[PDB]
Write a protein that holds these residues in place. Structure first.
Motif, PDB file in Angstrom:
ATOM      1  N   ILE A 149      35.312  38.802  45.577  1.00 25.32           N
ATOM      2  CA  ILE A 149      34.774  38.609  44.232  1.00 25.32           C
ATOM      3  C   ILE A 149      35.788  38.056  43.226  1.00 25.32           C
ATOM      4  N   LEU A 150      35.334  37.122  42.393  1.00 24.60           N
ATOM      5  CA  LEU A 150      36.159  36.553  41.331  1.00 24.60           C
ATOM      6  C   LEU A 150      35.383  36.619  40.024  1.00 24.60           C
ATOM      7  N   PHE A 175      41.344  36.321  27.152  1.00 19.61           N
ATOM      8  CA  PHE A 175      40.855  35.975  28.477  1.00 19.61           C
ATOM      9  C   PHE A 175      41.135  37.149  29.386  1.00 19.61           C
ATOM     10  N   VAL A 176      40.212  37.338  30.319  1.00 20.13           N
ATOM     11  CA  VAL A 176      40.289  38.401  31.296  1.00 20.13           C
ATOM     12  C   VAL A 176      40.003  37.839  32.673  1.00 20.13           C
ATOM     13  N   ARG A 177      40.780  38.256  33.662  1.00 21.04           N
ATOM     14  CA  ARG A 177      40.555  37.811  35.027  1.00 21.04           C
ATOM     15  C   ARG A 177      40.453  38.959  36.028  1.00 21.04           C
ATOM     16  N   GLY A 178      39.456  38.913  36.907  1.00 28.41           N
ATOM     17  CA  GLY A 178      39.315  39.970  37.887  1.00 28.41           C
ATOM     18  C   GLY A 178      39.121  39.487  39.313  1.00 28.41           C
ATOM     19  N   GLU A 179      39.590  40.313  40.246  1.00 31.32           N
ATOM     20  CA  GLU A 179      39.503  40.061  41.682  1.00 31.32           C
ATOM     21  C   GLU A 179      39.247  41.364  42.419  1.00 31.32           C
ATOM     22  N   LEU A 228      37.258  46.545  42.159  1.00 28.59           N
ATOM     23  CA  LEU A 228      37.753  45.383  41.448  1.00 28.59           C
ATOM     24  C   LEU A 228      38.938  45.751  40.600  1.00 28.59           C
ATOM     25  N   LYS A 229      39.778  44.756  40.351  1.00 28.82           N
ATOM     26  CA  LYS A 229      40.931  44.938  39.492  1.00 28.82           C
ATOM     27  C   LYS A 229      40.857  43.865  38.415  1.00 28.82           C
ATOM     28  N   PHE A 230      40.927  44.274  37.156  1.00 27.60           N
ATOM     29  CA  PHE A 230      40.863  43.326  36.049  1.00 27.60           C
ATOM     30  C   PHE A 230      42.164  43.308  35.277  1.00 27.60           C
ATOM     31  N   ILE A 231      42.565  42.131  34.808  1.00 28.92           N
ATOM     32  CA  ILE A 231      43.774  42.032  34.009  1.00 28.92           C
ATOM     33  C   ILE A 231      43.522  41.149  32.793  1.00 28.92           C
ATOM     34  N   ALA A 232      44.120  41.508  31.662  1.00 31.32           N
ATOM     35  CA  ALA A 232      44.007  40.698  30.459  1.00 31.32           C
ATOM     36  C   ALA A 232      45.140  39.692  30.551  1.00 31.32           C
TER      37      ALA A 232
END
Lengths: 215, 174
Positions: A8-9, A22-26, A38-42
């Motif tokens: 998942i992206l 912006f936030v990004r998760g994988e 899932l792990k999310f990072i700002a």
């Protein structure tokens, strides 16, 4: 379609009362077991808003539908082509979120791409003033939206406040398929428990999330 | 006798005090219940000022004069409502037509030779929710220890009146 583990992206762009981020998760999903990790990072530093409020914005397609409810997976039936989701989130006594997202396959990959505009949030509000770092279990009431050959959803999220009070978030949701034949479901619901945590060796603003969803 | 003029978002009796009973009749954009609270120095009278903050809906600013005019007690009031939301509990008329019992906490305001009061009114909403804050100031127009008032009200309508109105019966004790 959804057997075993799918990568998942997640990508989210937002603006809340002028604060751009912006936030990004994988992570990965187990639709068979209705599991998400899932792990999310700002990627722009500190979030001007609480992490829990973005949980619902940040792949229901990973919900575990029972064998006898399979024809009701409108979500999976629209894959790999996407399904064009939208929400309006009204924080009672608080701002409002308008979101537009695309949930789709780029092969085995997915990715979720979202756009968020927050307006009328109050300074010293429950949101911009920074809510406990957790999430409760809720029910997602869905139904069919025949005209648009898609779905609508309604629910109220309960955010625990540090002072013992509760910040309500009315969610209004609409989903439309990107590529035409999807299964229009009968009325039913999703129950969805979640666990939020942090990665101790990550200094950046982030979110570790574990989710379990059933129909 | 009571007459009130107010202004919201551009949209602009007798009783027996000794036993604390009131009977009043009112005749005509906002819900009637929200105006209930708005509508020793006598006969010279008093000034009544309030700021009413609807939880998360808006604020009422009021100025009133309560005094005797002959053998009639008159209440002339000014109310300005601002920042009320469209499709909200007030302008959207989602409040049921009733009123709960409340307590008015009164305290002295020595500097101004008058009083201050604080209380929170709970307006029942049609969907089962509650619409909530009253800040009040009283000043004598020409020349108590802490306690409170217990209030009970009954709202009704006059069946032979086609016009917008509200019939009120109120009981208040200290």
């Amino acid at each position: 379609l959804f057997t075993g583990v799918v990568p998942i992206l997640i990508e989210l762009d937002g603006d809340v009362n002028g604060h751009k981020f912006f936030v990004r998760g994988e992570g990965e999903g187990d639709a068979t077991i209705g599991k998400l990790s899932l792990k999310f990072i700002a990627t722009t530093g500190k979030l001007p808003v609480p992490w829990p409020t973005l949980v619902t914005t940040l792949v229901q397609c990973f919900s575990r539908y029972p064998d006898h409810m399979k024809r009701h997976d409108f979500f999976k039936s629209a894959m790999p082509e996407g399904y064009v989701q939208e929400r309006t989130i009204y924080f009672k006594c608080d701002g409002t979120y308008k979101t537009r997202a695309e949930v789709k396959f780029e092969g085995d990959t997915l990715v979720n791409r979202i756009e968020l505009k927050g307006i009328d949030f109050k300074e010293d509000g429950n949101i911009l003033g920074h809510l406990e770092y957790n999430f409760n279990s809720h029910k997602v009431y869905i139904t069919a939206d025949k005209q648009n050959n898609g779905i609508k959803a309604n629910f109220t999220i309960r955010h625990n406040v540090e002072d013992g009070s509760v910040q309500l978030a009315d969610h209004y949701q609409q989903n439309t398929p990107i590529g035409d034949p999807v299964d229009l479901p009968d009325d039913h619901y999703l129950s969805t428990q979640t666990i939020l945590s942090k990665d101790l060796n990550e200094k950046r603003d982030h979110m570790v999330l574990l989710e379990y969803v059933t129909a």
